[PDB]
Structures are given as structure tokens and as C-alpha cells.
From a paper:
As our own initial studies indicated that MtFad32 tended to aggregate, we decided to crystallize FadD32 from M. smegmatis (MsFadD32), which has 74% sequence identity to MtFadD32. We determined the structures of apo N-MsFadD32 and ATP-bound MsFadD32 at 2.4 Å and 2.25 Å resolution by molecular replacement. ITC results showed that ATP bound to full-length MsFadD32 with a Kd value of approximately 36 μM, while AMP (control) did not bind to the protein; Moreover, the N-terminal domain of MsFadD32 (N-MsFadD32) alone could not bind ATP. Superposition of the structures of the apo and ATP-bound MsFadD32 revealed conformational changes within the N-terminal domain. Firstly, to accommodate the adenine moiety of ATP, the side-chain hydroxyl of Ser314, which forms a hydrogen bond with the main-chain carbonyl oxygen of Gly344 in the apo state, rotates 180°. Secondly, the side-chain carboxylate of Asp232, which forms a hydrogen bond with the side-chain hydroxyl of Thr187 in the apo state, rotates approximately 90° to make room for the α-phosphate of ATP. Thirdly, the P-loop moves a relatively large distance (5–7 Å) to stabilize the three phosphate groups of ATP. Of note, the conformational change in the P-loop is accompanied by the extension of a neighboring α-helix where Arg118, which in the apo state forms hydrogen bonds with Thr191 and Arg192, forms hydrogen bonds with Thr187 in the ATP-bound state.
Residue numbers in the entry: 3 to 482
Write the structure that this text describes.
């Protein structure tokens, strides 16, 4: 394995950092290869695939982009309110193609979406809404509950002919400030927090994920999570940078029959590589409980699974044991479970376990962990408690444990606030100048010897994650 974007430990972008340039490249050299597939379980139970090749994907992207360039201006924000299907990605990439700031959200009519859609739209004030014909009515209804002066143009992406792309203008190469999209994430503030993720942020973090998971050509990506999610888009954005196709289903499709995700994770005949996917802790439990094939099932081979990214709350030892007990007999490698630390402020990925290692879980003093120190004890101990690792910090980014008040790096084992830095870090919160400075632009005033900030410059900006944790024995631990 070798990362095509890394040269001498440095992330190099020869063909720019435009993910638009990457998609167009595949559309030119492998236009007839599969790019994106949506497993539709709305009608049938084993699902019918909706496919979209690289050239087809480009055709739809440029068509929507051309329409957006007629009704929006550079700097405008375009909210994506499609149902979870192919048209969602068409809309999202379409907004990027148009040279506008995408805002990945959700169809209001779709159930199981957590987020204050009203307050979010209040924050970014989009000039256009992207949806589908099937959902356009529900969208128009939702906006009737909003003031008249904030009911922006609604565009059904599937209603835009392919030949519209004829007038599409490719936006000039973006610098390091050009915002690709706004990623809104959970918070307790009244005004929702939308991380400004630049094209440089996107490309950098995708590369950092590729490096961490040893992603290659031949590796296909899979996801069931809603696109509006801290880890909802990363696997999809992986496909254009790596050149292999991405497969997805609705969240509800997974909840109904989690075996569908297990099946798609499994080896297909013709596979030259592994499967990469994402699943929070509860998803592992749900799959282990309801996603194991009945007796008499067709062969299930999970020996191909490369990485299932699991974030961001610490994975349970009980969950790890249960999932391996359930799918281990089907060939599932324990090392495929990749516990990780991630957040929207860093685009997503910050740390995960090494490629050849299983989830590291250690037994530490329960109350000493409460006193702010990580100390290993025996399993027999009455003060014993299991604590799972978040692995090691990815390439071209740093994480440090600091004393929050004095901005001073702490010795290993000691719990403090986690500060992070790198080119994947967002450039602020939309519409929150002061909150942006406070969170994204901190200076590290003191380092230990050795330091976890080794490689970072003095004027490197550090992100106050708000999370607390500690380094222990070469691994990062999130404790709060």
C-alpha cells in the first residue's frame, strides 16, 4: 500500500484539491464505471440498485450546477433537502460544481432526523433549496411555516434536463479560504453551529482517512447513516478521491433489516479489495442482534471487511465482544472494527487505531480516572473499569492534551482538554465571528518534552474541541 497523495510524509495535491476536478477526471477516463449506487428498499425487500456511472454523475452534477449559476451568486449557500437517494449526492456535488456553499441537510418529510431545521436555515440563509419532485411538496409546505421573506427558490434536481449543463461554468481553482460546504452539528447553543469546511479541508481529511484505513482502488465504500451526520458524508467523498464506487442505503432500511448492511459489507465475487464503512456503537449492537443470517442462508463471507469506522463516543468492550461473537464465524476480522475520534470542526477524522491492530481496550483505575489520571490496573481489581482507545492521530494533524486555562501541554496519563490542529480544521462557525476566534484560533503556549505537537509551527491555530481526554502508551483516550 502507498498513498498517491503523500510524498515524504507531506500531503501533496498535484491535480489541485478540487473534488470536482477528481469526479470530472473519472468521468473522462472511466466514464462507464460505476460511481454511486443507492439500494432502494422502499418497494422490494432485497432491494433494487439505482446506479450512476462517473459520466452520468458528472452529467447530472453539471446540469444542476448550471441551473444554480442562473439563480445564485458566488458566496451564496445552497441547502440540500433531498431524500436519501442518488439525487441527494447529485444536489450536494451540484452545489460544489456551481461554485456555491452546500449545506447538507435532510428532507423534512423524512423521519428519524435529529436537528433544528428552522434555526439552521435561519443561520445560513440559503439562496436556493435543492430537493426532488417527490419531496418538493413537503418542502414547500415546510417553508410555509416560515416568514415570506425567507422562502428561497426551490429546485427539483431531477427536474433539470441534462442539456442544461451546456452553459455550466467551471469555477476557478479554489484557494485555502474557499468554503466547500457548511457542516451543522449538534450543540446546546440556540443558534446552531455550522462548521465552515473548505475544499482544502475536505480533500485533506479524505486523504488523511485514506492513509489511516489504507484505502485503495478496489476498495468500495458503504454507508447507511443519514447524509446529515458528522460521519454521514466522509465515505461518499472518499469515492472520487480513490476512484472506486460508493454504495448507500437509507437509515430506516438499516434499522428495519440490519442484515442488509451486513450483506453489503460481505464479499462479492469480483471483489479486488475490502469494504469501508461507518457505524456508531448502537449500530454494532443492532446488527449483532438482528442482522445475523438465519440457518439455511446463502454463504456470508465477511473476511473482506477492511474498516468499519466507529465514532466518536468510546466503543464498548461489551459491544466489541458481541459483534465479534456474532459475525466472527462468518469470517469477520476483529481488526476491521476501527474505533476513532472525530468531529465536524476537523471536517471529521482525527485519530484511529493502526491498520493491523484490533481495538485497544485497557483496564484502568475507575476512581483515579475520575481524579484526572489514566492508570492501568488488573481486571480482578475492585477499581477496575474497561476503557477503549481512540487510536493514534492521523497524518498531517496534531492532538495535544492541555491545561485549558494556561494553554499548557500536559504529561501523558494526565487528563486535560483536547486541542487539535491541521489543514483539515474548519475556518470557523458560520455567522459566529467571536465564537469562531475562540474555538478555532488558539495558540499553544507550552509544550512537553517530547510533545504531541511536534511538527506544528508556533503560530499554528489550535481547535478547542471541548472534549477531555489523555494520551496513554501511544494511544489517545477520550474520557469526556
Amino acid at each position: 500500500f502507498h498513498n498517491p497523495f503523500i510524498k515524504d510524509g507531506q500531503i501533496k495535491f498535484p491535480d489541485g484539491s478540487s473534488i470536482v476536478a477528481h469526479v470530472e477526471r473519472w468521468a473522462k477516463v472511466r466514464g462507464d464505471k460505476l460511481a454511486y449506487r443507492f439500494l432502494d428498499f422502499s418497494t422490494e425487500r432485497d432491494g433494487v440498485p439505482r446506479d450512476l456511472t462517473w459520466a452520468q454523475f458528472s452529467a447530472r452534477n453539471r446540469a444542476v450546477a448550471a441551473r444554480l449559476q442562473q439563480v445564485t451568486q458566488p458566496g451564496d449557500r445552497v441547502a440540500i433537502l433531498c431524500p436519501q437517494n442518488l439525487d441527494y449526492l447529485v444536489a450536494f456535488f451540484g452545489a460544489l460544481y456551481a461554485g456555491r456553499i452546500a449545506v447538507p441537510l435532510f428532507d423534512p418529510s423524512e423521519p428519524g432526523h435529529v436537528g433544528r431545521l428552522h434555526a439552521v436555515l435561519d443561520n445560513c440563509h440559503p439562496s436556493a433549496i435543492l430537493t426532488t419532485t417527490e419531496a418538493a411538496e413537503g418542502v414547500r409546505k415546510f417553508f410555509r411555516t416560515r416568514p415570506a421573506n425567507q422562502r428561497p427558490r426551490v429546485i427539483a434536481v431531477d427536474a433539470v434536463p441534462d442539456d442544461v449543463a451546456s452553459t455550466w461554468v467551471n469555477p476557478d481553482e479554489p484557494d485555502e479560504t474557499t468554503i466547500a460546504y457548511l457542516q451543522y452539528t449538534s450543540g446546546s447553543t440556540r443558534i446552531p453551529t455550522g462548521v465552515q469546511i473548505t475544499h482544502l479541508n475536505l480533500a485533506t481529511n479524505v486523504v488523511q482517512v485514506i492513509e489511516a484505513l489504507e484505502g485503495e482502488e478496489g476498495d468500495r465504500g458503504l454507508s447507511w447513516l443519514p447524509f446529515f451526520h458528522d460521519m454521514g458524508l466522509i465515505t461518499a467523498l472518499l469515492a472520487p478521491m480513490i476512484g472506486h464506487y460508493f454504495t448507500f442505503m437509507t437509515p430506516a432500511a438499516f434499522v428495519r433489516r440490519p442484515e442488509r448492511w451486513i450483506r453489503e459489507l460481505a464479499r462479492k465475487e469480483g471483489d479486488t479489495g475490502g469494504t469501508i464503512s461507518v457505524a456508531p456503537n448502537f449500530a454494532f449492537d443492532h446488527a449483532a442482534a438482528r442482522g445475523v443470517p438465519k440457518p439455511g442462508s446463502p454463504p456470508l463471507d465477511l473476511s473482506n471487511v477492511k474498516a468499519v469506522l466507529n465514532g466518536s463516543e468510546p466503543i464498548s468492550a461489551a459491544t466489541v465482544r458481541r459483534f465479534n461473537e456474532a459475525f466472527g464465524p462468518f469470517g469477520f476480522p476483529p481488526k476491521a472494527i476501527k474505533p476513532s475520534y472525530g468531529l465536524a470542526e476537523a471536517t471529521l477524522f482525527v485519530s484511529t487505531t493502526p491498520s493491523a491492530e484490533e481495538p485497544k481496550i485497557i483496564t484502568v483505575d475507575r476512581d483515579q480516572l475520575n481524579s484526572g489520571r489514566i492508570v492501568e490496573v488488573d481486571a480482578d481489581s475492585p477499581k477496575a473499569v474497561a476503557q477503549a482507545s481512540a487510536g493514534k492521530v492521523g497524518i498531517a494533524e496534531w492532538a495535544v492534551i492541555v491545561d485549558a486555562e494556561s494553554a499548557t501541554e500536559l504529561p501523558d496519563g494526565q487528563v486535560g482538554e483536547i486541542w487539535i490542529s491541521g489543514q483539515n480544521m474548519g475556518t470557523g462557525y458560520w455567522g459566529k465571528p467571536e465564537e469562531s476566534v475562540a474555538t478555532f484560533q488558539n495558540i499553544l503556549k507550552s509544550r512537553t518534552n517530547p510533545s504531541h505537537a511536534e511538527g506544528a509551527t508556533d503560530d499554528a491555530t489550535w481547535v478547542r474541541t471541548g472534549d477531555y481526554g489523555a494520551f496513554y502508551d501511544g494511544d489517545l483516550y477520550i474520557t469526556g
